[PDB]
Structure formats: structure tokens, C-alpha cells
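Researcher: Final request for today, and then I'll write up notes for the group meeting. The sequence and the SMILES for retinal follow.
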Amino acid sequence: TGRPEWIWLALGTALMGLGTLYFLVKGMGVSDPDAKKFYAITTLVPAIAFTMYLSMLLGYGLTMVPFGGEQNPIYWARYADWLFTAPLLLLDLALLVDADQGTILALVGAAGIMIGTGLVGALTKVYSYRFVWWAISTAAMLYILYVLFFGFTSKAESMRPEVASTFKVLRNVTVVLWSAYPVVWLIGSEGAGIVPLNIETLLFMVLDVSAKVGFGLILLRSRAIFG
Ligand SMILES: *C/C=C(C)/C=C/C=C(C)/C=C/C1=C(C)CCCC1(C)C
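Model: Predicted protein-retinal complex:
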């Protein structure tokens, strides 16, 4: 096939794999229970992304959805990725500020809706309705971000400055990166079809890698992960 976006798929696979091994090696060396917890979660994130990026590279997770009078290429493998990686990243932040189970349940649930409606919209055949689902998915993300910024930040204040300061960084990187996904979707192949798939793939890999490996490097190198 040799699609124009394969090189970015290959780069995403490479970066996710390397980040996975590094976390794995670093994680199985630590003896602290709590640290192990964070390491197990943070290592699984890029591991899942690696498998999906590899699959897409190999030609899977791609489907032609008709709308706008075209046969549009929609990489659904991404949602198979985010469905598990998104909530896991949320869990890392939750464990960091000692969030409550109710909060975590609510966040993971909102994340489920976000990815769920997102995929449904990316698969919808009625052009205008694709944006209705997109809208609902974004509303769910805003809820998540609101909770992360107003709820979590507040409880991170009961933690030590080192833990609070580590969370602020992860929170910030998360808010900035996550906020970009809906925009890319809107102007990309799933939406207006303004930005070509090759470039679109480039944008998503940069966001995915930064939100997983970048997020992990920051979290796993901090002393805030220790019990
Ligand atoms: C490693 C992957 C991460 C951190 C992915 C985060 C993804 C989002 C915040 C995705 C959001 C979306 C919307 C707000 C609406 C349209 C569809 C999505 C799923 C692209």
C-alpha cells in the first residue's frame, strides 16, 4: 500500500516501543510498592499504543467511511488505543493526588463516553451528525479537564509540595495535549478534511508520544511516586 502517513506510523511505533522498554526496565528495578504501582500503569500505556501503531503500520485499524461524497480513510485503531490508555493516564493522576474512588469512577466513565462517542462520530455516515457526536465527546473531555484542574489540583494541596508540583506539571501537559485532539479531529480526515491524513497522522503521533512517553518520563523520574 505505502500510504503517505506510514513514516509517522513507523515513528510512533518506534517511540512507543522504546519508551515502553525503558519504563519496564526502570519499573522492575524499583522495590517500592507504590512506585511499582505507577510504573506498571505508566508502562502499559505506551505498550498499548505500540501495539496499535504497529497494527496501523501493518495495515490494520483502517476503514473507509463514506460521507461528503468521498470514501474517507478512518483509522479506528486509535480509539482501541485511547479507550485503555486515556483512563490509565487519568488513573496515574488520580493515584498521585489520592483522589476518591467516586471521582475515579466518574473520570473513567466520562473518558469512556469521550472515546465511545468519538469513534461513533468517526464512523457516522451522515456528515453533519459526525459533528454531533464530536460535540458530545468534546463535552465529555471538558468535564474531565475541569475535574483535573479544579478537583484534583485542590486535593493535590493535601500532598507534599514535591507531589503537588509533580501533579501540576502532569496536569498542565495533559490539559494542553488533550485539548489539541478535538481540534485535530475537527480539521482532519474525520472532520472538515482540511488537513491531509499524512499531516494529521503526524500531529497525532506528536500528541500521543508527548502525552504518553513525555508524561511518563516526567512522572517516573519524580520522587512523588514513592509510598
Ligand atoms: C495517549 C492518548 C491520549 C492521551 C489521548 C487523548 C485523547 C483525547 C483527549 C481525545 C479526544 C477526542 C475528542 C474530544 C472528540 C473527538 C474524538 C476524540 C476521541 C479524538
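Model: The two ends are 50 Å apart (CA to CA). The pocket of retinal is lined by residues 49, 82, 85-86, 89, 114-115, 118, 134, 137-138, 141, 178, 181-182, 185, 208, 211-212 (CB under 6 Å).
Researcher: Thanks, that's everything.
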